Amino acid sequence: TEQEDVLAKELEDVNKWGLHVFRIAELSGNRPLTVIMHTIFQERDLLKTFKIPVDTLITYLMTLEDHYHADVAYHNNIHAADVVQSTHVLLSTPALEAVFTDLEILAAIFASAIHDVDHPGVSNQFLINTNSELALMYNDSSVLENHHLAVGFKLLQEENCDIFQNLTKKQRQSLRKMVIDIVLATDMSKHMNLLADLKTMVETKKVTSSGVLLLDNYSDRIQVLQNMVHCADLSNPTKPLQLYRQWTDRIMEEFFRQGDRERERGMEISPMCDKHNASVEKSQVGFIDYIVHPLWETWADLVHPDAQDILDTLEDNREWYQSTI
Numbered sequence: 001t002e003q004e005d006v007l008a009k010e011l012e013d014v015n016k017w018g019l020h021v022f023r024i025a026e027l028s029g030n031r032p033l034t035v036i037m038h039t040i041f042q043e044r045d046l047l048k049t050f051k052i053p054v055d056t057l058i059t060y061l062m063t064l065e066d067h068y069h070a071d072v073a074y075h076n077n078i079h080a081a082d083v084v085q086s087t088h089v090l091l092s093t094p095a096l097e098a099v100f101t102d103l104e105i106l107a108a109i110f111a112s113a114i115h116d117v118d119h120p121g122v123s124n125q126f127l128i129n130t131n132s133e134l135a136l137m138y139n140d141s142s143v144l145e146n147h148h149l150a151v152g153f154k155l156l157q158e159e160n161c162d163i164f165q166n167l168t169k170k171q172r173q174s175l176r177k178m179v180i181d182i183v184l185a186t187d188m189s190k191h192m193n194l195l196a197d198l199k200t201m202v203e204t205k206k207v208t209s210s211g212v213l214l215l216d217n218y219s220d221r222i223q224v225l226q227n228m229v230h231c232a233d234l235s236n237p238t239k240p241l242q243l244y245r246q247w248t249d250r251i252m253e254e255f256f257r258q259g260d261r262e263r264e265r266g267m268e269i270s271p272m273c274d275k276h277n278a279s280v281e282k283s284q285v286g287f288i289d290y291i292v293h294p295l296w297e298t299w300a301d302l303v304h305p306d307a308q309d310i311l312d313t314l315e316d317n318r319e320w321y322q323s324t325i
């Protein structure tokens with residue numbers, strides 16, 4: 001059709017920060033995760049490298065996409081698609097050229113795709129406070145993030161879904177470990193510790209003779225990939241404003257809906273979740289000043305100057321939201 005050529009044209013931007021991911025969700029028939037993952041796998045030659053049969057890739061991607069909730073405004077398949085594509089661009093940065101194996105690239109991108117699957121649109125703390133089945137199963141520790149990993153790996157077992165069927169045993173074992181390490185690190189309560197280790201690596205940075213970042217050991221390697229996917233997760237305020245604003249609209253609907261459940265249950269309402277006492281603009285500014293900018297400023301230092309434009313957009317968007325109060 002012609003509609004698929006409009007999508008093919010939009011998928012030419014897959015290597016650019018600020019891809020119009022909502023448009024790709026429209027043109028793909030609510031399949032952004034599938035088409036962006038497929039496009040990225042092609043672009044990085046991962047199907048040939050890992051002997052992934054193309055029909056197995058599509059079947060798994062669609063089943064994965066299916067297990068994101070379409071009735072959750074933020075933590076859905078579009079967010080998933082966005083984090084995948086943002087990680088993809090972050091992998092491409094000059095300061096990281098030829099740093100990561102094809103297996104590590106594969107783990108980072110797969111982790112990003114599964115990283116929020118079957119998110120119910122409420123927080124870990126809500127799930128703990130309400131004595132949810134999820135919290136009971138995972139003993140109040142990385143409750144959502146454990147669940148995303150369990151669902152993401154378990155779907156590889158569905159008919160014609162094992163996109164890793166042609167990896168060696170040791171490649172599967174290494175990848176499984178790296179993916180778990182990555183997604184468990186997206187637990188928001190780990191951000192401070194994650195950023196502290198990132199600062200320390202920035203303060204003791206070492207580059208090779210090609211001016212490219214030097215990582216001697218699994219600990220440093222996995223930690224860079226953990227922060228990379230965490231940054232991609234918290235990248236909405238680094239995007240062009242017309243994108244950023246829709247992500248704000250979507251997170252506040254989710255947060256407001258959680259607050260209405262907290263309120264009905266007699267609970268104290270979570271930060272930013274009270275629709276009767278909200279301050280969306282001041283919260284975005286606060287969230288950038290205390291969380292997103294300290295994080296992205298540190299990442300920008302790690303890959304300096306590759307990330308300068310991304311950080312400038314972040315600063316402009318913070319200025320814009322500030323100007324509305």
Ligand SMILES: COc1c(OCc2ccc(F)cc2)cc2oc3cc4c(c(OC/C=C\C(=O)O)c3c(=O)c2c1CC=C(C)C)C=CC(C)(C)O4
Pocket residue numbers: 075116188189191233234236237247248249251271272283285286287288289290291
């Ligand atoms: C309880 O702690 C807080 C928090 O406290 C209140 C607060 C207020 C002002 C402050 F300055 C400091 C704290 C405020 C938060 O505000 C948010 C706003 C967001 C997005 C968020 O989701 C994370 C992104 C991806 C994903 O969840 O998948 C959050 C949070 O998760 C979040 C958290 C937890 C996250 C930590 C790192 C600690 C996503 C999209 C956009 C960018 C549009 O706006």
Ligand SMILES: [Mg+2]
Pocket residue numbers: 115116144186187
């Ligand atoms: Mg998450």
Ligand SMILES: [Zn+2]
Pocket residue numbers: 079083115116233
């Ligand atoms: Zn996320």
